[PDB]
């Protein structure tokens, strides 16, 4: 679920970020590393804000709203980082909204590869499963990415945790396909995020 919009795609592949007050060495180290993990695979490049109108702010408060989809531009844009959401591939998904990347359970073709099971979303959370409409996304032919870090787990904002809120609709390479993995970048999310950024 890569945005349509180039304007919100950061020129040059270029983020410059600022690290808040109130994390610990350990933090601060997770999102430099999680940046890091980034810039490896990718030709997106994390800078230290000097004077740029344009910047992320690594935010110390409750997890959860909001991550800002690419470059906002004409200002800061924060990402919230509290006690149960700072890990490494939780950090790495959100730096996947912030190169321009939506939940990949939104894509608009997303109906031919899960079942939403809207029964047993929490009520008032099914907007959460909105399909992103298709004037607002463009995959670049890639395929549904079931691994993608930026996809939900299979009881994300479930009524209970037996109880899932996203089911694959087929096999691959012998088993439904597991979803909701937050330790790396994906095969998927690296080469659709280099074609996003037209890297070498
Ligand atoms: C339950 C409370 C709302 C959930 C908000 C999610 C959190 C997320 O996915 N974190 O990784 C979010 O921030 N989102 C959704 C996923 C991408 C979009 C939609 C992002 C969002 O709300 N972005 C913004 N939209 C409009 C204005 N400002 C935004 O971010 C600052
Ligand atoms: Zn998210
Ligand atoms: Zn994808």
Known sequence: AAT??????????????????????????????????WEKHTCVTFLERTDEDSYIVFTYRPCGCCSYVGRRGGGPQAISIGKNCDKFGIVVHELGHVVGFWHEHTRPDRDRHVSIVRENIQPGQEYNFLKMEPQEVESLGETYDFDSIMHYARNTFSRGIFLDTIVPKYEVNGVKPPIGQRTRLSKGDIAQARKLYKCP
Do not use: L
């Open 4 to 37: 349509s919009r180039p304007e919100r795609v950061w020129p040059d592949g270029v983020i410059p970020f600022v690290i808040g007050g109130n994390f610990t060495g350990s933090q601060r180290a997770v999102f430099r590393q999680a940046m890091r993990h």
